[PDB]
Design a protein around this ligand. Structure first.
Ligand SMILES: [Ca+2]
Lengths: 197, 211
């Protein structure tokens, strides 16, 4: 039953009540309730698929059996020193965290480890959908094979921004696959590229 | 109960009855300020007869190291399509195409926690191409290159157009999203192909090479 001073959000819930009335007495006079219960259930479905936890001073981000540990130091009110440790994912993620830990830029670190796990789950369920949908077999996350042909799946970074884009390679030919993924789309194209060539 | 702050200021994350199932309201706000760091967040606006769903979009600025104020996009529980969300009040820059992203994802038909996470991540992404791209020009202030100082003169809202001085000569530039490519350059006023290549690698490493 706590009345929150948020004070941006309260200036917003008022504004567009007022900005649509610029079209010619719309003010709230009432403040929202706060209940930690729902607030948590929301922060849950935003992390969904991954847990955040804290053993001071470090704060762990974990999707099963993977741990990205961020130890952070703050001299009020500003961050100073950030440091990081991973497992098994050092290489795949390396380039973006070169940047992150090098600027001591925190959210770039996190949001990139989040979206890497998401591009990894996307590829893994993309490769499942391909293997059972045709004659293909699997080696690791990276690769699938049909006879003499090897198609790799994995992410690259445009170094500034934490959002990875996907890169589907193969032993040559490249021009051909790349275009059958664009026109016919990543699954139906990589199915088609396992017929012609 | 006011240990919760609107901005995600760094102190809340550190030092030292069940609330949320957690230990105490402090140890909840340590967890909440932790998660929120990712820059994207889901949080409830709760009223007695309704609950809106807000979307926290927060950038980390490295000049003074702190986050910029949270941006909110807010979603109303719908009517006439009964159990789904619809768009309500947004303060976001006018460069972010907010509505084209809503349709690209939900098609207005299915609004699902799964699909709404995909919705922010699209907005937030367009927000960091712009911010990260402006900020790269702020970070160079005071830095030399070729032992000539760089000061910045002017940059526009979203930073396609820029003017800096490099040690006594004025370079102007124009950029094209989302290539972050430099399409035009004016060196001391005359046309220049040298710096042209790209917004990052080429505007340090290629500034030394020819000019
Ligand atoms: Ca409803």
């Amino acid at each position: 039953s706590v009345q929150l001073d948020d004070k941006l959000l309260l200036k917003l819930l008022r504004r567009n009540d007022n900005a649509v009335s610029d079209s010619s007495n719309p003010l709230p006079r009432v403040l929202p309730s706060l209940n930690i219960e729902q607030r948590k259930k929301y922060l849950d479905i935003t992390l969904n698929d991954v847990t955040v936890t804290c053993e001071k001073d470090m704060i762990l981000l974990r999707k099963g059996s993977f741990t990205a540990s961020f130890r952070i130091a703050v001299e009020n009110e500003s961050i100073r020193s950030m440091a990081i440790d991973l497992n098994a994912f050092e290489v795949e993620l390396q380039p973006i965290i070169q940047y992150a830990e090098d600027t001591q830029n925190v959210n770039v670190a996190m949001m990139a480890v989040v979206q890497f796990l998401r591009i990894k789950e996307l590829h893994e369920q993309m490769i499942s959908k391909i293997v059972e949908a045709s004659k293909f077999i699997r080696a690791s996350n990276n690769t699938i094979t049909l006879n003499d042909l090897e198609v790799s799946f994995h992410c690259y970074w445009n170094l500034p921004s934490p959002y990875p884009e996907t890169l589907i390679l193969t032993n040559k030919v490249q021009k051909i696959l790349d275009f059958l993924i664009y026109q016919y789309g990543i699954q139906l194209g990589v199915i088609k590229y396992g017929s012609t060539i | 109960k006011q240990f919760l702050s609107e901005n995600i200021n760094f102190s809340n994350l550190m030092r030292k009855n069940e609330v949320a199932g957690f230990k105490s309201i402090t140890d909840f706000v340590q967890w909440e300020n932790s998660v929120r760091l990712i820059g994207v967040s889901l949080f409830p606006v709760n009223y007695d007869n309704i609950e809106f769903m807000g979307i926290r979009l927060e950038l980390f600025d490295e000049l003074s190291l702190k986050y910029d104020p949270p941006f909110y996009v807010i979603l109303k529980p719908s009517v006439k399509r009964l159990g789904i969300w619809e768009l309500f009040k947004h303060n976001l820059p006018k460069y972010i195409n907010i509505h084209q992203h809503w349709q690209l994802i939900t098609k207005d038909t299915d609004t699902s926690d799964s699909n709404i996470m995909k919705f922010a991540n699209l907005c937030y992404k367009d927000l960091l191409k712009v911010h990260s791209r402006v900020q790269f020009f702020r970070k160079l202030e005071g830095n030399y290159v070729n032992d000539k100082q760089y000061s910045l003169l002017h940059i526009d809202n979203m930073g396609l157009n820029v003017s800096f001085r490099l040690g006594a000569d004025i370079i102007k530039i124009k950029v094209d999203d989302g290539d972050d490519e430099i399409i035009d350059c004016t060196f001391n006023g005359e046309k220049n192909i040298s710096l042209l290549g790209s917004i990052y690698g080429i505007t340090n490493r290629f500034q030394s090479i020819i000019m």
